[PDB]
Amino acid sequence: RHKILHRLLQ
Amino acid sequence: HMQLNPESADLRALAKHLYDSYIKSFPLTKAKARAILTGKTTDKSPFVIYDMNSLMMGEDKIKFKHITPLQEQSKEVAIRIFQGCQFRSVEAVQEITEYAKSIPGFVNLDLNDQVTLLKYGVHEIIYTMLASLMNKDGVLISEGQGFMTREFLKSLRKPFGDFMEPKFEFAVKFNALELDDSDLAIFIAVIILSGDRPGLLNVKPIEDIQDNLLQALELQLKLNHPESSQLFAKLLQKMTDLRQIVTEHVQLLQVIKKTETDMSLHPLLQEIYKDLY
Ligand SMILES: CC[C@@H](Oc1cccc(CN(CCCOc2ccc(OC)cc2)c2nc3ccccc3o2)c1)C(=O)O
Numbered sequence: 001r002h003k004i005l006h007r008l009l010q
Numbered sequence: 011h012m013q014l015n016p017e018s019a020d021l022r023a024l025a026k027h028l029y030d031s032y033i034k035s036f037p038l039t040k041a042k043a044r045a046i047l048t049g050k051t052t053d054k055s056p057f058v059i060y061d062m063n064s065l066m067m068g069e070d071k072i073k074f075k076h077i078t079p080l081q082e083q084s085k086e087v088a089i090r091i092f093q094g095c096q097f098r099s100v101e102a103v104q105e106i107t108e109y110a111k112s113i114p115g116f117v118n119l120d121l122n123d124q125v126t127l128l129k130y131g132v133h134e135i136i137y138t139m140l141a142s143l144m145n146k147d148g149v150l151i152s153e154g155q156g157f158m159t160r161e162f163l164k165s166l167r168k169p170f171g172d173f174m175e176p177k178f179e180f181a182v183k184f185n186a187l188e189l190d191d192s193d194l195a196i197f198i199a200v201i202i203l204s205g206d207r208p209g210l211l212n213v214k215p216i217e218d219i220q221d222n223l224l225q226a227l228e229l230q231l232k233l234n235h236p237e238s239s240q241l242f243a244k245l246l247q248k249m250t251d252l253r254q255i256v257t258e259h260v261q262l263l264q265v266i267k268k269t270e271t272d273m274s275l276h277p278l279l280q281e282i283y284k285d286l287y
Binding site for chain 2: 002003
């Protein structure tokens with residue numbers, strides 16, 4: 001995935 | 011003929027909303043950068059790094075956000091510089107992510123599509139924003155605290171001497187368009203919402219937002235650049251050039267990966283570059 005990117009979007 | 015109607019009235023409201031959040035999301039705007047680059051302001055007087063001796067004095071006198079006297083730093087200036095770029099990019103990913111959320115409709119998109127748009131948009135936006143901090147002599151660094159010359163960056167040992175040159179080359183052409191922050195705010199918003207990125211799943215809501223943004227941009231350009239028709243088409247074509255330098259930059263990044271010790275890329279940057287182009 002893009003865990004960091006996902007985290008940032010949240 | 012163009013006319014003031016409810017449609018254009020909303021287009022202007024959108025353009026102002028983007029600008030307002032663009033200014034809140036990004037520290038050094040082009041307006042402030044241009045003033046610095048011409049001394050036409052205060053605070054300013056950035057430390058100029060133009061040779062190896064001024065680099066050493068600059069590292070001492072500039073307060074780099076990624077400083078800390080306790081950390082261990084590479085013995086090569088070329089790698090210390092590469093690390094500074096890494097730190098700035100990571101910050102830019104967050105600024106761009108914040109700005110994206112402020113784009114009407116973005117948060118209501120498929121969260122997995124938001125990720126894909128950010129993945130492919132950040133670096134095109136980085137090079138767009140980077141031009142605001144560039145003239146033909148060098149580039150503003152450390153939120154304007156420093157200025158590093160173009161020729162000093164070219165003098166770095168292979169392959170780092172070739173890192174920034176394509177960006178300067180793009181910036182020269184791009185800055186001749188004489189865009190301001192108001193134009194920039196819509197332009198980068200149009201970039202983030204490219205409905206043609208690989209991997210998108212819910213493409214219709216993206217193209218619907220990007221069309222609204224493309225309308226707002228065209229109106230912005232006509233209203234703000236009377237002495238230059240075709241600015242809109244030239245600007246769209248500059249996205250094409252952006253995708254190419256991002257591609258050219260990925261290739262350069264692989265040389266440094268299989269040539270330098272470990273050359274750790276920040277995990278955020280790895281997510282972005284993994285399976286990119
Ligand atoms: C490294 C991997 C990275 O490549 C790149 C490619 C091009 C540009 C950058 C980062 N960059 C240059 C700042 C350097 O700043 C220093 C800091 C310390 C220093 O030490 C003396 C020297 C220079 C930048 N400017 C910006 C202005 C506005 C918005 C975003 C901006 O991004 C990184 C990638 O692929 O993401």
